[PDB]
Design a protein around this ligand. Sequence first.
Ligand code: ZN
Ligand code: ZN
Ligand code: ZN
Ligand code: ZN
Ligand code: ZN
Ligand code: ZN
Ligand code: ZN
Ligand code: ZN
Ligand code: ZN
Ligand code: ZN
Ligand code: ZN
Ligand code: ZN
Ligand code: ZN
Ligand code: ZN
Ligand code: ZN
Ligand code: ZN
Lengths: 182, 182, 169, 169, 182, 169, 182, 169
Amino acid sequence: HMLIRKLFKFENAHVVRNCTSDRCKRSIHGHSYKVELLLKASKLDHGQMVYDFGLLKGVIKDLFDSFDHAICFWEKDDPQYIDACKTFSARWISLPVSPSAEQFSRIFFYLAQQVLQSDVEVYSVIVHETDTGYAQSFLEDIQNEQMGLLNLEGIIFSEQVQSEWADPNMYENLKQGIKFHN
Amino acid sequence: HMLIRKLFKFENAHVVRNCTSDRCKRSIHGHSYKVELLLKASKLDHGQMVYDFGLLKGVIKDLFDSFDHAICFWEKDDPQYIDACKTFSARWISLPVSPSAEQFSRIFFYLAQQVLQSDVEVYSVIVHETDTGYAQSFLEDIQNEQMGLLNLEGIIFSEQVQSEWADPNMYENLKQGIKFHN
Amino acid sequence: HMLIRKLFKFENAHVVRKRSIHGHSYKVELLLKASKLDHGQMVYDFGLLKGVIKDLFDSFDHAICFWEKDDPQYIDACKTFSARWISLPVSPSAEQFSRIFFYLAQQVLDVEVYSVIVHETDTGYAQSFLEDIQNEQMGLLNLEGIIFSEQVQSEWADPNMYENLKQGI
Amino acid sequence: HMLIRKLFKFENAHVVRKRSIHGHSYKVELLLKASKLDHGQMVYDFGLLKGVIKDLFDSFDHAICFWEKDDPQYIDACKTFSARWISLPVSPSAEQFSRIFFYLAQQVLDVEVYSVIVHETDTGYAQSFLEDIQNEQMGLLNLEGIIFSEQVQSEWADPNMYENLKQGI
Amino acid sequence: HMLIRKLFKFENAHVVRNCTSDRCKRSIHGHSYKVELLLKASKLDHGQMVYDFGLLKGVIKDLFDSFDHAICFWEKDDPQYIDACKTFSARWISLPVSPSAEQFSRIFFYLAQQVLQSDVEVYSVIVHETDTGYAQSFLEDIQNEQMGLLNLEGIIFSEQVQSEWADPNMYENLKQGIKFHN
Amino acid sequence: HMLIRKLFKFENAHVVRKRSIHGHSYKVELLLKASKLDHGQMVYDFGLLKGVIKDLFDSFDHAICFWEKDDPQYIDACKTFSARWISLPVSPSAEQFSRIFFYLAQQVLDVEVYSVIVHETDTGYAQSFLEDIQNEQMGLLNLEGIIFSEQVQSEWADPNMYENLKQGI
Amino acid sequence: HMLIRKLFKFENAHVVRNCTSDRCKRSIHGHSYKVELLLKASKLDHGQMVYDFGLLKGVIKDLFDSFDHAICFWEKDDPQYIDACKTFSARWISLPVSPSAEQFSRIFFYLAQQVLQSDVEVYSVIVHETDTGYAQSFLEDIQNEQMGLLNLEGIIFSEQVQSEWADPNMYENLKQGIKFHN
Amino acid sequence: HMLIRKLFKFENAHVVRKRSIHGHSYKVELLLKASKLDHGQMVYDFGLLKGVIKDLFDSFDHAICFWEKDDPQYIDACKTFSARWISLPVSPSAEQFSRIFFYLAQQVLDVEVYSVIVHETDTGYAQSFLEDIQNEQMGLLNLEGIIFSEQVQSEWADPNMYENLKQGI
Ligand SMILES: [Zn+2]
Ligand SMILES: [Zn+2]
Ligand SMILES: [Zn+2]
Ligand SMILES: [Zn+2]
Ligand SMILES: [Zn+2]
Ligand SMILES: [Zn+2]
Ligand SMILES: [Zn+2]
Ligand SMILES: [Zn+2]
Ligand SMILES: [Zn+2]
Ligand SMILES: [Zn+2]
Ligand SMILES: [Zn+2]
Ligand SMILES: [Zn+2]
Ligand SMILES: [Zn+2]
Ligand SMILES: [Zn+2]
Ligand SMILES: [Zn+2]
Ligand SMILES: [Zn+2]
């Protein structure tokens, strides 16, 4: 259709857990991330325009900034680690997948894809991970269950992450059918 | 065919009007824009060559520089706003669409497409909007009526915008059939 | 003798009395000198002190700017235009932005403001030092002659934080 | 009066007491002055002396950093979190990174350390000089108050090389 | 096949002649040019490897550097201009097309295409013209007679341009069948 | 002690007596010092004063440049070549461009010209200061020894504005 | 599938041998190289995730860093040269092809392709050679016998190159079937 | 007080006594000061004086470099390796490249060499000044202790031009 790119950035720490392999150690990854959101629009109606100081980018930015100065962990990580995570940072995000630049590109696609119910369609997300590389998601990657199924209830944002939202009920509104931009 | 890119830039303020949604506020957007004009040429005859200090780029640059240190508003905006716009800036442009980076890429495509009647064909326009992203138009986007139909009489340039043209009758010449480069 | 640079951007419209209207992307370098590194004057993102400084600096972003001493019936047309406006005690330019941003950051703050660089699109920059702030020939800066709008003040973390700053608190 | 710049990167998490957690890409410029260019003080990649300096500097990479004087039960949560940790004698920031990296490089080394620039993502930098290292107001730096973890020390070419440095050898 | 890009640069002045249109003026264009040579190789034999301090890139560089600190004019320009060109610069190149960034990309393609007789194939040339844009040639553009047919005898290099060649008979060797890299 | 940089580009051909012909993209940094910021000396795009400066600077763009003291029968061949020419009182180079652009901007203008940097393609730059303008060893600069062509003068906003500048007005 | 790029760099010297052509001289090439590894992943399981301070990138980095501050020569070079190579640098690599940016892109593809036996697939390698250009390998280039067949036993790493590996038996493990990440 | 920068690149291998072998892309900034701008000392591309300087600087490109005082039987292996070699009177590094390139450019040349910056890949740079050239502690530089090879000397515009420089001519 018509290609739109929108640029976001965030600063993050996240956990990669290990194998039971004897050489595989657990690691944490604080990096700078850059995010290209790639949209295709068949229609530039006002309700799905994306621009600063408007509502719809306001929600996408608020979800995307949730990962900024937050830590991300897997749901199925060991609960001693997860409890040390929540002590570590009051900004924490619980993910249904192990956090990576790879899965961030799937997660940010899905979050933007869910927000765009309010034509305008998420085409792709590229997440650049510092100077070491990028991951690019497409639509097939989102519905890939071998990659790990993404539902809105599988991403759990912290209270303090919700504390900085413009609307505190933003994410719960999209868990229901509640249509965003009248 | 053969790909030509030509680079333009302009500095602009424009209006995005709001919904009747209770949270949707009106916003103004002063930014730096960069413009990639993408041409395909089957023939490098002199009359549709594009180069500095020649006539045909002279007209495309003059139309493109119309948006520089100008304000852009929608035709169907509220007339108190539109009259405040014309008081605000003697460089003003009235648009048949709400101004955005998205619609600039359609508008600049169409303006360049209309100028190239004087082979050489506008392929695409990319408008980069400061560091926050870009919109890319193709030919399907121009004739999309859901995006908003573009005619030459729907873009109204200010007197003071016309004041800086190399030819004051440039735009009126293209409203008629008047063929540009003999 | 610690040099700290902190980096800001904003996207602004403003006026100069042809009278001319200026929509540009801006970049700010805020240059600080430090000799304590005590926590109350620390500049870092998700704490408090840079939160004041970034709120005052992002106040200029998607707002228009005008002179006080511009003609009144264009000042209404400035603030009919959108509810993000800042009234300025000098005529807004990138030269005057570098003085104003220096003055705002200095009033917030042993961290002192050494210099402010404001880049205006690709056409260059202005760099204020402290001596530029102390000219009445460049236009004297006090706090109350900068007036932010009601909806500029809406976006701030504390909406009262400018009105605090003009008092002791 | 030879200026040498050597360039380093690292990817770090750290803490500041809202208390806030900071994951950033960092860049280091290490600025040296030289007047001998004798081989034992030479800084070059696959030899020895920059091998000490890069090992100490890459120690900060995919590790977390915390204060000594942070609360103990969050310090356990800092080092439950991963086995790459560094205990620091000041509260970690990019300002304090520029002092610490200066101090580590100076202790390694006629090459002396002139300045260290540490860039924190795209939000700017801090630049230490020697006078910044000699403030107790900024937090006094000795070698033993920096504690690297057991697995930070694992990655080094000699794992003993810090414990050598605190002695004469 | 396998994509190879090789980067060249040159500094040039050239003539664009005008119409008999009353507003169309003659112009000269001194610019910095950057050149991407795009090769596809099915075979990395030694004789058509391209690398510094080898023979085959040596010839391609020598032809490409012919345009550096040279002036380019059209063959069919007015002979008073052409004679003023040869007085102006002892480095001059006579071209069978009007010189432009557009035609440079065709000319450099053709020159590299002719040199690669000595598998390895010119895919494309991109000529970037200062900060104002680029032209990209493909193989269809070379054999386009509407763009202007390119033969080796239609490009005439100056004596002083030939003076800087590693081999003075390089270009005459390729006018014959003389195979380059034994 | 306000530093202002304004940025310009131009695309030029010129001559040096092998005699050699030079077609390059150029970038100009114009460095100004300011202590008034009064409106008549203000440098900004769509007003007036930078309109003089950019017209004189864009005069060099898609024009050829030659020495006065070049041989006459190549000077005709210089201005047979195109009607955009500038006669120069020194032999044109990027070194002499930085002096000439300094001199033109100084004659236009409390803003004074501090320095001019002219970058010649990717091969480097020349940076004039005021002391470079005051050498007869570098070639003395007066206004009338720079001669713009008839069609260089055609493109200007006022075509008379150079001939104004040589007088008081 | 899903595109992953991972960035590597190395600093290298290598030999290009000559023809029996009278003008073809032997040359050595010390350069800075930048390496884009392009992966396609159908599955982000832990065992073929690529990330710093994990095992699988650890091996790919260790093989890639083998070329850093090493010299590369052809197996079929003259043995006086090869023996002068091994005297010259205790970090040396013997290659079954003549070393170039072109063949590095094939070699690095193949090495990464062999390491990914432990879904995740090497798509492409781009090797940028200083500021002068790049070579891009795809899968067809690897199995091209006209380009020169790549087997693990044809790349011989020096003892001192092996000395810096995290595992000294890494390369021998992949010569056997020994599966890497349990 | 004219600053001129001219920019050069070269792609080099060299040795340091693990003994380590170094293949890097290099960038050179040559910084000059000027007060005459007379034509015989002019630095510009397709004339003569930069032709000497670029030939001497491109001599380092796709050549190996070694110490004089390296062991002989590795010096044969250095110049068995290719016929582009340069014998150096100091051990080659980017620090010593900045001194050598300074010394070569100074000997060629009122233009004097102010400084030379040599950047070694992405790991940083060394910047020589004149005082660095006048240390015997850094290794004294004379012209004859730099020996270019027979085929390095082959590529030059005059192959004799170094052997001219060591004499008066
Ligand atoms: Zn594992
Ligand atoms: Zn990581
Ligand atoms: Zn709305
Ligand atoms: Zn905006
Ligand atoms: Zn005025
Ligand atoms: Zn403006
Ligand atoms: Zn606090
Ligand atoms: Zn932070
Ligand atoms: Zn014409
Ligand atoms: Zn041009
Ligand atoms: Zn001469
Ligand atoms: Zn030149
Ligand atoms: Zn050969
Ligand atoms: Zn090479
Ligand atoms: Zn040693
Ligand atoms: Zn090295």
